[PDB]
């Protein structure tokens, strides 16, 4: 058989039982698209109305909130896909691209150029397009104005 323990638990104490749990949880938290809300204590006196800014300053630095605002500005948050333009948006701007498909990068600049977006809100790479905030869900909105 298995040369180990078997009935009851293994020789798994409370720690081991709870450690198995402690792995699954963390993994399954890694398996998802995480969304965050950071919350700030206004003072320690339990006082409504009042707020202390030395406490917010110390909060922002330690929890790295400044750094967060610093990364959203510099990044390109959403590594999504090119064909999502032409397939769906035929409805929006019918004469965006004619008969003449070639460099798909160049085809897509033309369709997105007709809908007037410079290639820095949506960033291009090779395979994929990166979307900054609004940009994909501005495209959705543009169709969904007439829709």
């Amino acid at each position: 058989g298995g040369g180990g323990r078997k009935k009851g638990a293994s020789f798994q104490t409370v720690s081991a039982l709870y450690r198995e749990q402690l792995n699954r949880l963390m993994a399954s938290l890694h398996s998802t698209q995480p969304h965050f809300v950071r919350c700030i204590i206004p003072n320690e006196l339990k006082q409504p109305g009042v707020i202390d800014s030395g406490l917010v300053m110390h909060q922002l630095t330690c929890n790295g909130v400044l750094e967060g605002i610093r990364i959203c500005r510099k990044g390109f948050p959403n590594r999504m896909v090119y064909p999502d333009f032409k397939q769906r948006y035929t409805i929006l701007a019918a004469s965006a691209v004619p008969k003449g498909f070639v460099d798909a990068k160049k085809v897509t600049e033309a369709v997105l150029g007709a809908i007037q977006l410079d290639a820095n809100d949506y960033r291009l790479g090779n395979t994929k397009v990166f979307f900054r905030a609004g940009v994909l869900g501005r495209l959705e909105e543009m169709r969904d104005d007439r829709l």
Partner: protein, 98 residues
């Protein structure tokens, strides 16, 4: 008329999808869109699904679900798999519909 040819020609297309080695992990994704779109339209499937979810699918673990990025050759092979999936199913659809 156009519909049987639509489901036929994508199988000529598909193998255009060029996966390429980006050695930081080896999770390759394929260098374009044209190759994929001339498939995608003729099916009229969600483009935003295809080019994400082919490389990043909802991996059923037993019965729960964990996302994975796939490594270069598995994806090339699965894409060649997508062609052999389309043709087998269609001719069997066709002989009965004949």
């Amino acid at each position: 008329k156009t519909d049987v040819y639509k489901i036929t020609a994508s199988c000529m297309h598909l193998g255009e999808m060029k996966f390429k080695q980006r050695p930081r992990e080896e999770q390759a994704e394929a260098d374009g869109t044209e190759e994929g779109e001339r498939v995608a339209h003729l099916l009229g499937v969600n483009a935003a699904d295809l080019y994400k979810n082919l490389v990043k699918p909802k991996i059923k673990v037993g019965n729960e679900m964990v996302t994975q990025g796939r490594n270069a050759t598995q994806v090339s092979y699965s894409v060649g798999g997508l062609a052999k999936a389309m043709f087998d199913r269609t001719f069997k659809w066709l002989v009965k519909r004949l």
